[PDB]
Amino acid sequence: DQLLGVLLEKAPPLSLLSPINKFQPEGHLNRVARAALLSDLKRRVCAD
């Protein structure tokens, strides 16, 4: 059941990331905006 764990291995963290990709229609932002979004995501993950 788990000896051949090729198909039974999928743990993508998306619960805290789904809104951040749903809000953006395209996501083509600048470097400052990308860095701010990354810092906000890191802070949210730390304070979860």
Add this chain to the structure above:
Amino acid sequence: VGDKLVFLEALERRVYQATRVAYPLIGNIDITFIMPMGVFQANSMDRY
């Protein structure tokens, strides 16, 4: 409940018998700690 209807059954008491194999889907966090020496008072602000 609410507006959702998802099948839910007690598979813990029927699969793995709760005593044969370890429970799957177990995470791990590898964090590290740093302890800086610190800094001293500039001229006076060290006590009250």
Add this chain to the structure above:
Amino acid sequence: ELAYVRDGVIQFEVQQPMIARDGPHPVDQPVHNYMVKRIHKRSLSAAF
């Protein structure tokens, strides 16, 4: 009639089947266990 009958025997069985669907447990070897039955006698006393 149980007074004239001594201690009997118990029915214990073990199974060593194959292994084909579960978590990745380490490979082991079939082993057997030995058990004994030691029951003492306890009784109080009374008099008039």
